[model samples]
Target: PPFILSPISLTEFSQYWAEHPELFLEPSFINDDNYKEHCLIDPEVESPELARMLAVTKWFISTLKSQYCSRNESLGSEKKPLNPFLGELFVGKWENKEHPEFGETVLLSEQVSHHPPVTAFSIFNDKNKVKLQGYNQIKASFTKSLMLTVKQFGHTMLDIKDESYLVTPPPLHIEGILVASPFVELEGKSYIQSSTGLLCVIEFSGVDGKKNSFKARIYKDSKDSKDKEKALYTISGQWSGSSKIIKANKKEESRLFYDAARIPAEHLNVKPLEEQHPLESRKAWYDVAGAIKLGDFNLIAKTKTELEETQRELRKEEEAKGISWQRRWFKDFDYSVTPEEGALVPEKDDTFLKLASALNLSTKNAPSGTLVGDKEDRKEDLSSIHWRFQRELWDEEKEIVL
Candidate 1:
């Protein structure tokens, strides 16, 4: 009934990843002559791994404003995002009509879990052979004050050609809750650990006495070394505004890394509601969204109840049949073990464990750890199963267009 409520469901939030298609496709164009002028990394001077890392980091920083602050900018304040129903799907693509060579980037965001609220997404550009797949869940708790702290679970895996980078999200908190104009602010540190032994540590703090400020360093892993490690580059600035990067050794020289405020977000093309699948996020919540827009509380309540009741009945039917709801594009797999031959999903246990351990992150199934892969590691109600995007499963399904 409150005016500060998000009309869209959380599943729709996944579209924020590729909103800036140029940033998303920059890594794929690192070598093309036409893209050389727009390239963020210098191919001649920087390693390809570092090039992709900077591109990916820059792209990641650009998404934060959309992910956390867009609502405040658009709707006058931050609002509570609608919780996605189990099996909800948000599918769309960024069609680079002006630059056909950039290719189309498709997104498939699915509500893979309900109890703890997990959203798994896969964004890929077929022509570029670049894929970004990840699943995220959040645990929220209220502080003594109006602030609401949220600790995120899960990590993102970025695949660029033969290399891969693991990204862990930063912790955040919601402010202004007591004033009815809530806003989100990021805190703590996030890491981008790569398989090539290069890692980026981004520390979010009031570094320059400004909000949304961050300082990041890219360097070799120093965990096994007895001596202190040196950073190759140090990036510092405001993520929501602009950030600059400088060589570690040359403190006086700095250049623009990314201008988040100046960059334009590409438009995402989605099918019409009538043409969309029944489970699509927009189609499924159509009535509720419309009611919210109209500011009709009774209509909103009625439409929401209709969908929730339908979901409850569906769950009851599944229980009566002694079955469970099945995910369309994702499957739960343990990442600590190798997959058998001809497995539907590829094995990532080694990659996950290696990066997580290198960052000193928990690899167990604990809330703080990565998903539990081994049955022996399962404790209490924690997730012993890791969700993965099963490309084969999506390939076999002909009904879905994504």
Candidate 2:
């Protein structure tokens, strides 16, 4: 995996610039200060030294980004039919028969179920609508549903280290925009024509050290020609650990179909015993008579009625089996860290402090009259003494996930 840059690295770079003011304003005697002037004249210009510095700086930034970005790509030829079931690992489609907001007349399938505790979801628009899904087994249950979702949704972590670097403060004007949105339109017409397919990706870190991720890609025939094949849509997702390691990968290809009847419900019961069971008193009495027949006719009649009532209740209970199954399958999850377990888990807070202190020591802006100290003392100052005693702090917050 490529190294991603982190905010801490940028902060260190900024701090270095603050301490070494001469690097920006005053030129060194070397190269007759031409190198310095060139740097000032065109900040964006790439010099061998500047490139080297950026390469080092960017490694940190990439590391941060890899922890927060998702990547997706079409498999094989890009052109493939959309398979709804292929990408549906944890679907909760419900008909809007009586929704409070949409009300009647809205019968379309709506997604109402919440995603798994460790999963994330996003929507993507290509030529076709694409839904991006993600999950991390380290942070989630290792159930069949989790496996299936990963297989269909695809996994990609938010890799800030990927080719796409975040542009600080998104553009306010059209000309400043770096990335284009397929769903956005210009003027009265669509700037980007409707796509035949769509792709979506998601990424996140997990509680465990391992990373989990998945992707989903939707494809369709070219709009202009039936003979040509193109990627109508695609969706991808990913997961990474605290150490920024990719662990799981999956992809799903799908196409749009008009066959509503072909869609299979998740909880369709096919048991003949459940379906053919008696519901009325006649059948109940017949069974009871076969099993036991008391001599008293009046007692038999009352017992038969009671048996019929019990059968009715049982049928009602069986009818609700689907709802009960769903409740058992999907429920809230609890997360906790015990002291003993925490002992084994790396102390990221301490690591961050150590790294920050090291960066601070590399700067030349130590307070005036401060005595020279040993390396251990300096580290202590950077990680503990400085953070605790220093009146002025750069920023209370240290890192952003992306």
Candidate 3:
């Protein structure tokens, strides 16, 4: 009987990316002097447009991460995937000295910030051009309001059912081809004001079926009516060729080349040994046949359920650890401090009194005057004092603030 393997879950993919942390960093090929010149000089001649180039470069990195990186992890530890139904939500305490009531408290779910997640969904039509759909959740009370926002922002609502499609490039009919280039053009001028520009390109080519090359670029428009002072940006670059097919036991399997300096690679789709190869110098390729043979429609859905479950389990464990730590830290503080007729008093409270005693602060002489005796006695007295206590639910398991 043939061996049957369990399907790879999204959670597993995410964990894989997390474990292989090096993939999160930008590629070194982007730093090449020729590539940098192309970014600045390709679309139009401009000043040393570092900011514009960076924006495009950053967006390309982020987009690749969003599409290829596992959904289980975030760009940074603090970032979270935008919830599709609830929109963008962020929970954090509002620390206002003047408004102590709102300080050091968890903001409830209802009170969390609501914004739209930066979403990207694409549909590759018969002609091989991708119709991109993107939206930033905006405040809207009615359908008309939502439509207005969509129109104003120049973004299309994704027809999820009809639009869903694999991002794999069309298979090349010819073998031994060195390069294949794909380009996309944007319709509106929304991103031009930011000087990020708007062109997307996907390039890939391989000699045999085993080795492949891949590179993507985003170009910003040169003219911007919104910002006369801002220079338009255009940037384009390529990843190195890093894969070569090799035979093992009369079968081929992709063997990733992990140079300490280069980006690490992985195969998202399940593939037979015959279709795999070691990435040569600067190459990355997905096993489309293997992905299809696995009875998975797409990599995203194949891993979604498993990834979500694992993420939840990890989050729960982290939250529990965080709560214990917070409890211990808060245990040393007294919440009993109260204002007595417009004066702050720390009497009759062991925790408060202990704090004052440790700092040599006299209850009668104002808490600020107490100096615990050191070379920087006055500074030392003020240093350890935490006027307010704050705890966040997300920060519990992760040491978000180092």
Candidate 4:
């Protein structure tokens, strides 16, 4: 709860930086839409496990840039992202040299909760026949390492022609939280499960006091026992540096995984704030960010508190009239058919919720589905703007960028 640096008193740097915090969001959030890379790689010839595991893994490998790798860009440091207020929205798109020639990918995000903050996003690229939508909820607590142990909830699903891939995002850890050099790293493992039997397993390794590591391998989940766990392709090395890719049982040269130490970032283009909506992220936090950047904590305190208070007032007024925030593009639907698919929903009126009071803000179904809160607490309503997300929203014409 305290920042290591008196610079800002490290006061709440965690929550601020924690805001842009979704690893999956960062995956496609930038122009490096690994999915964009995922859809583009195949030569239009092969398929396995009823799908393309090789090409899909590469997209996952497409990173090693923004995740832990992004630190070098800031010279082994982290920057605070604008803390999003409930109802604050961010909209933009991803385009490339080939865009306008074919089409583009569009993005939409809304910060729907506070306390245990959560953000849900949608991305669609009809031209290439790829679309994905997911949300993230971060639950953190003080651990023995003096760092926060973060449990992230929600999964990303991307559809192709006849099959789709369901991605389970990894866990995170805030390193050096008690020191002057705090940063984030992926800690455990994340899986990219496809409708086809093929699968990609991505693992991250690092303990409290050590260098980080990353590697990814793709293999078919063939019913034949002998074919499981063998790497069709393997990429490994320091994610904050360069990774080497070895084609284990296939025809291809052992090559270096995408290099992150050198290339400048491929920027995701967005419109000017002057032309954006009132809910737009930059517009909504314009005053606060400016004050913070100027090192004017006094103004930052005043501006941010006022913004939060005004939002609270609005929500209270809405509740006074029994109104709930609307679904701009997403609509909530139950996902309990797959249990681990969401955060563990503690039994209603249980002691687990009592242990993690912030969880009072959490849901059994993160991005989609749900039921909870008191019989009278409107915010706890499943329709609760506090707990809802649309599973699908596709607009071919509108999704395209000019």
Q: Count the backbone clashes (under 3 Å) in each candidate.
A: 2, 51, 25, 4
| Candidate 2 residue lDDT tens string, 57-84 | 2222222222222221221111111111
What would the per-residue lDDT of candidate 4 be over residues 1-402, giving only the tens digit for each residue? 223211111111212111221212222322322333333323232344322455445455444344333233345344454546666566665554443533455566766555556676766555655656666676678787576776666555565544566665665655555344455666765666566556666778756333556767766652321343476667677665667666554436556655444443324456787776555666666677667666778998998887777767766765675444434454444423244444433346432223123222233443321113533223443322222334343242232122
CA error at residue 204 for candidate 3, angstroms:
11
lDDT of 1 by residue, 74-112 (tens): 445445478899987888998888888888889999999
Of 1 and 3, the candidate ahead on lDDT is 1
Residue-wise C-alpha lDDT for candidate 3, range 1-402, written one tens digit per residue: 122322221112122211222221212123334444543223222422332333233323333332222122212221112232111111222223343322222121111111322222211111222122222222222233221111111122111122111111111222212223111111112121111222233333323222323333333432232233232322222222232211122124322322122433432222233432211000011232234346566764554444445445644665676534222111111223343353333336333344334324332211222224533343422222122112233335243220
What TM-score number comes out for model 1? 0.83
lDDT at position 154, candidate 3: 12
Best by TM-score: 1
Ordered list by TM-score, greatest first: 1, 4, 3, 2
TM-scores for all candidates?
A: 0.83, 0.15, 0.23, 0.67
Q: Which is the winner by lDDT between candidate 1 and candidate 2? A: 1
Highest lDDT against the true fold, candidate: 1
Cα error of candidate 2 at position 354, Å: 1.2
Task: Note the residue pairs that clash in candidate 4.
Answer: 3-10, 330-390, 331-390, 381-384
Alpha-carbon local distance difference test for all models: 0.72, 0.22, 0.26, 0.50
Off by over 4 Å in 2: 1-53, 58-351, 358-402
